[PDB]
Write an enzyme that holds these catalytic residues in place. Sequence first.
Site, PDB file in Angstrom:
ATOM      1  N   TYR A 509       4.255  -0.633  20.434  1.00 36.20           N
ATOM      2  CA  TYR A 509       4.267   0.296  19.302  1.00 36.20           C
ATOM      3  C   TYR A 509       5.715   0.660  18.931  1.00 36.20           C
ATOM      4  CZ  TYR A 509       2.894   3.916  16.025  1.00 36.20           C
ATOM      5  OH  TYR A 509       2.696   4.658  14.856  1.00 36.20           O
ATOM      6  N   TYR A 593       3.396  -0.019  13.253  1.00 38.25           N
ATOM      7  CA  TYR A 593       4.802   0.022  13.560  1.00 38.25           C
ATOM      8  C   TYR A 593       5.073  -1.034  14.592  1.00 38.25           C
ATOM      9  CZ  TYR A 593       9.513   1.935  14.046  1.00 38.25           C
ATOM     10  OH  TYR A 593      10.867   2.160  13.985  1.00 38.25           O
ATOM     11  N   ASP A 670      -5.724  -2.340   2.593  1.00 35.45           N
ATOM     12  CA  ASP A 670      -4.911  -1.395   3.355  1.00 35.45           C
ATOM     13  C   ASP A 670      -4.135  -0.441   2.405  1.00 35.45           C
ATOM     14  OD1 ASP A 670      -3.158  -0.024   5.186  1.00 35.45           O
ATOM     15  OD2 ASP A 670      -2.875  -1.738   6.351  1.00 35.45           O
ATOM     16  N   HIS A 702      -6.286  -0.245   7.234  1.00 33.80           N
ATOM     17  CA  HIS A 702      -5.332  -0.317   8.310  1.00 33.80           C
ATOM     18  C   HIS A 702      -5.894  -0.368   9.732  1.00 33.80           C
ATOM     19  CE1 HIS A 702      -1.204  -0.298   9.294  1.00 33.80           C
ATOM     20  NE2 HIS A 702      -1.338   0.687  10.154  1.00 33.80           N
TER      21      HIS A 702
END
EC number: 3.4.14.5
Length: 728
Positions: A509, A593, A670, A702
Amino acid sequence: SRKTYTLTDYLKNTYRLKLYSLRWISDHEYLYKQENNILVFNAEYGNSSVFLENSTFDEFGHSINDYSISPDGQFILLEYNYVKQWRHSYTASYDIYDLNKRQLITEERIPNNTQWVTWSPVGHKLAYVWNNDIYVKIEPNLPSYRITWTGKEDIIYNGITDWVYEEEVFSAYSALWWSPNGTFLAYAQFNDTEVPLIEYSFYSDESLQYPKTVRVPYPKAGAVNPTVKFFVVNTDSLSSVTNATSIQITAPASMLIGDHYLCDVTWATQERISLQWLRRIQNYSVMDICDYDESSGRWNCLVARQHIEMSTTGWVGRFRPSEPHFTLDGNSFYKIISNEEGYRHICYFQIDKKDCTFITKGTWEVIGIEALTSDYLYYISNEYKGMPGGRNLYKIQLSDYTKVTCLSCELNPERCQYYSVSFSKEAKYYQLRCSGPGLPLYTLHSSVNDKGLRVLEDNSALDKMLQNVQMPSKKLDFIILNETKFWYQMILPPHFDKSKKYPLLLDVYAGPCSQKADTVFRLNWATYLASTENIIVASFDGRGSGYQGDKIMHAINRRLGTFEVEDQIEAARQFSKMGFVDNKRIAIWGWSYGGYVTSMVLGSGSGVFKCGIAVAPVSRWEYYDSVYTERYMGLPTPEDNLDHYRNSTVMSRAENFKQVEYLLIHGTADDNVHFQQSAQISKALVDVGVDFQAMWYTDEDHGIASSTAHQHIYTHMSHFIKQCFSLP
Ligand SMILES: COc1ccc(-c2cc(N3C[C@H](c4cc(F)c(F)cc4F)[C@@H](N)C3)ncn2)cn1
Ligand SMILES: *[C@@H]1O[C@H](CO)[C@@H](O[C@@H]2O[C@H](CO)[C@@H](O)[C@H](O)[C@H]2NC(C)=O)[C@H](O)[C@H]1NC(C)=O
Ligand SMILES: *[C@@H]1O[C@H](CO)[C@@H](O[C@@H]2O[C@H](CO)[C@@H](O)[C@H](O)[C@H]2NC(C)=O)[C@H](O)[C@H]1NC(C)=O
Ligand SMILES: *[C@@H]1O[C@H](CO)[C@@H](O)[C@H](O)[C@H]1NC(C)=O
């Protein structure tokens, strides 16, 4: 031992963690739902009775999605016809059922496509939002009072948030706050008039001949943002004939000279509200305290009550300014703030006085304050054993700050190191919930002498099943980069043999204030990969990561795409030097991310990684929303931080992907990380002759969370990983 934990086990929820979700309804009673009964439990003695049988609504004719019982027990709200919008928004229909008369209210019903309904915190008033306007019902069988007349789809939002306030500021659709009494209703109004729209195609069912264009106001980094106003209405003085008077509360002078956000709303008393505001340069905030004036019927905010919280090394808060916890009197409060050395500790503030008094300190962080009574403040921190990824409940005696008692640390130390908590009203009782590293365990406790009362749920059923599976282990430990400790977790295959070389998948992440090494127990994709496929799955917390101070957290400031990416490459090199890892089989993967980090790592030219999977990645920060981006990155202008915006793209690293096998995945609907992001990555790789694999998921967002897509993506990813690792 026997069968392993398979992909199907994960995909089909074969081994289920049990929960104990309760709802406190007083200082000593809670509601709990034990198979199609609502039960009320008495916390002190543990006796229960049925509140409501589900049979009650066998001939209601609609599938009930959720319910909300009025605080006074009189009515229940029934939610059906549920339609998801974004992460927290959704619309629905609502019926109110009178629990004394044992019948539905058939007159003056809540309309269809209601966006939001809340009970007052006392009694049985309702407030709801329909068509971007607020309505208040004093009695559930009576006609509603319309509060706002300005609501306008896609443009003016009264009492509900727009896209970016939902996602990045409040983490909620709701922007309505009842006073503790229910006398006043505060709300925010958002104005998206000039916010540009993201547009994308929604294909829908195969029966739709022409696709739909979805258009959402969404400020990308540097763009025009929504504006906000704030208002308070007295709901005990409403008229059938005269339109409702909402009193505006304006933002301070120090905010109003530029773009700003309303970032927190907290009632302090029956007649005092606190508001936190944030500048669009998110290094500066102001708390206002606003007192009601009985004489004018207005709200006054004395400049001398304004508290400033600013940062000189980064931004304010972890994600936003932390919320204050007021003393019953409303004249003072407790708040978590970063101290002189970078560590987030609890500060005591008195309302018409300057400074603040730090009541905790140390090389660890307070996670959150959970309850405040006249004698003790109960908080959650990671102090115990200096493990940033552990969590424990503590109390501090308000008459002597040196008297701190850990209330959870030694309840069950091998099994339990990661607690959350839920206090009853007035904090007479608390539920502790541990999530790891053993199976979750749910317990009830009394605050008077901190006695255990009752185990609620011990997950013994799941324990027994897992004794029957060859389960992987978790190692949690630390390495050193540059005289600092950085934590990592490893999921190790069962029957681990350190004299054998294992393939490693790095799970990433690494977003700001993230933490991926912790004591939580999880059954997930990594479990399968370690148990069946004998892959070590590792996760590493480097610079940028949270819960270890600002020095680490803010290293990444104005600089996304750098240290957090390097640190992952370095962690990998150090994993490969430990002798049980096959250094010709290291892969990387991440979502959101983590997909941006994965791509930047694959595109680094480091030579460490064979292959990787990026799911719904960011590729360039100008594409992502202003609130989150500008927090970490400033503005994409030449007077501010345009140059690092341009140096931090995935696309600029395209040539380097010729050294790796890359799999890129994105949902086409998304609304958060736009398909645009991956479209631009693919286009850069083609322009440069790099081959790669792709998968789009039609109409998924998402989370790619619809259950057939969830299954198909984890399956698609498992084949890619198996092939890249020459696994049969
Ligand atoms: C007390 O209020 C809080 C406390 C914490 C958080 C919070 C937010 C958060 N975010 C990650 C998310 C995000 C970031 C990306 F870079 C991305 F590509 C996709 C994506 F969904 C952001 N919109 C916000 N992640 C963890 N925590 C939010 N509100
Ligand atoms: C727990 O047990 C007590 C005691 O039997 C219940 O308390 C009684 O509650 C009913 C309704 O509140 C009263 O009419 C009784 O007179 C109460 N009696 C006593 C001696 O306390 C309580 O209702 C039970 N609670 C739950 C949640 O089932
Ligand atoms: C809040 O925001 C900005 C960005 O970090 C800061 O303004 C800069 O101040 C620095 C001081 O180191 C100057 O070198 C820059 O020229 C300024 N840049 C821009 C584009 O404004 C401001 O200092 C920050 N405020 C606080 C409280 O630290
Ligand atoms: C709630 O507070 C308001 C303002 O202080 C007051 O007018 C009202 O009487 C209160 N309601 C209660 C506690 O009965």
